[PDB]
Design a protein around this ligand. Structure first.
Ligand SMILES: CCCCCCC[C@@H](O)CC(=O)SCCNC(C)=O
Ligand SMILES: CCCCCCC[C@@H](O)CC(=O)SCCNC(C)=O
Lengths: 170, 170
């Protein structure tokens, strides 16, 4: 819980298993990695007073998903903005000092009410930690929002991610 | 509303705007496309009696997302399986004859309670259309499940996808 911001290089180190070590939380590597940086992470404050993260993804027209999603109608997939939020909540669990590899477990309501176009400059994620367990199973529940250049465009309530020292139950 | 099965080639045609026509519903192209084939699509039956789709994705170890998600611990992104269910619900709106381009609007509860490993053979999607509106807003509400080689692994309730003849709304 020592560092309160991470650079892209740190996130890529995490993707290689080199931030949290053997058997522990990894972020997806490119091209599934949906975060460039965590500008702030803490175990206090946020909407429930149980911690929060603020992170960013830089947008430019050349990001791979614009060319296929859709042809002649480029828009960032909503599911990748949602994955950034599961990615962040997983990271938080590792950052707190819990062992195990991440698996998203789901969410309550997800809403997409705006879009990221290839003319956008920056997407900002806000994550509010609602509750963590680490007696027994390791589990985080969180709410999140996605904003593009100042404008709220997605929300997710009850994001759930687990860390697992064995993933043969799945 | 007359063809009931669609091959990968038909789905790739759809990604180019050539199944439902220009300005109308498109699937994503690879690598965001998460369906190889629609085995069945109907506007009757299913859990609500208001329509259903059954669709498949073939799994092999060389699919692109396995290398990066995660490194040394391959597993299909839940977010892409979810997107497959949004992709299918959008397809159903296009298949019904409605004009306009697709956008996922969200879902109620998403649960991931098992995983697709690179040794799996085939992912099956089941979509049960719950409600469609085709006056004013064009909107579909659906439930879905994802299975892998017979085993149920994901669920989503209240998948929502809209068709938009203008997307500057978003
Ligand atoms: C640094 C820590 C990151 C852990 C969270 C990564 C974001 C998830 O969306 C990726 C999966 O969980 S893909 C597998 C989805 N779940 C199952 C049960 O297969
Ligand atoms: C024929 C299939 C097209 C309908 C839905 C395709 C699958 C969706 O996941 C893609 C988006 O909607 S990406 C944009 C998410 N929504 C907004 C408002 O940004």
């Amino acid at each position: 819980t020592k560092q309160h911001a991470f650079t892209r290089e740190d996130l890529l180190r995490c993707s290689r298993g080199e931030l949290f070590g053997p058997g522990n939380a990894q972020l997806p590597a490119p091209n599934m990695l949906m975060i460039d940086r965590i500008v702030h992470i803490s175990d206090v404050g946020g909407k429930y007073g149980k911690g929060e993260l603020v992170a960013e993804l830089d947008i430019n027209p050349d990001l791979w998903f614009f060319a296929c999603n859709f042809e002649g109608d480029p828009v960032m997939p909503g599911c990748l903005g949602l994955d950034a939020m599961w990615q962040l909540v997983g990271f938080y669990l590792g950052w707190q000092g819990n062992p195990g590899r991440g698996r998203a477990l789901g969410s309550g309501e997800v809403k997409f009410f705006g879009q990221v176009l290839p003319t956008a400059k920056k997407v900002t994620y806000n994550i509010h930690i609602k509750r963590t367990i680490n007696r027994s199973l390791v589990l985080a529940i969180a709410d999140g929002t996605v904003s593009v250049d100042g404008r709220e465009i997605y929300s997710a309530e009850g994001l759930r991610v687990g860390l697992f020292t064995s993933t043969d139950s799945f």
